[PDB]
């Protein structure tokens, strides 16, 4: 029944060392200037986070290449099998079905 006590040791040793390093000398008796100087070298920066298109398409493109490796995941379990002409010719399909999705998008990526 240790899996599950194989990690709750590891996280309660993790959260131990945080509060002892951070929070315990955070109650110390120094002067502790609380003035708004804590931000470094970008003093005010009175703006909202602007949209960047070339850093959105990187999120979606990965997600659609991430799905069909989980289809591709039970290939070693698909070895000790019955009829294997089917198993080979279907395994080669998905990879090409992943490969074409490159080549269409490959004619327009952008400065990624």
């Amino acid at each position: 029944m240790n899996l599950m006590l194989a990690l709750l040791t590891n996280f309660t040793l993790a959260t131990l060392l945080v509060i002892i390093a951070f929070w315990l000398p955070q109650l110390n008796v120094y002067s502790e200037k609380t003035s708004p100087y804590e931000c470094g070298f970008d003093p005010m920066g009175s703006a909202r986070l602007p949209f960047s298109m070339k850093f959105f398409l990187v999120a979606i493109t990965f997600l659609l290449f991430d799905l069909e490796i989980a289809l591709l995941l039970p290939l070693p379990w698909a070895s000790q099998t019955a009829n294997l002409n089917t198993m080979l010719t279907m395994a080669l399909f998905l990879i090409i079905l992943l490969a074409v999705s490159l080549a269409y998008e490959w004619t327009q990526k952008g400065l990624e």
Binding site: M1, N2, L3, M4
Partner: protein, 71 residues
Amino acid sequence: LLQAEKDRRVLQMLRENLEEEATVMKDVPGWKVGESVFHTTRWVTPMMGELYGLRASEEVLSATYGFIWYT
């Protein structure tokens, strides 16, 4: 042989969980002894509650959750 030593376990388990149930209470608004829940008289497999009844103390946990979370 490993099959023929396993089926002998559950009939002992069914007998003790019935014979030490038939001596518990014989009420007139109670049970008949030897009945089944189903209409069809054919040997269906038993259940965890059939073998290990209302006991549920230690060894029943090692029976169910033994193979999972470890050797």
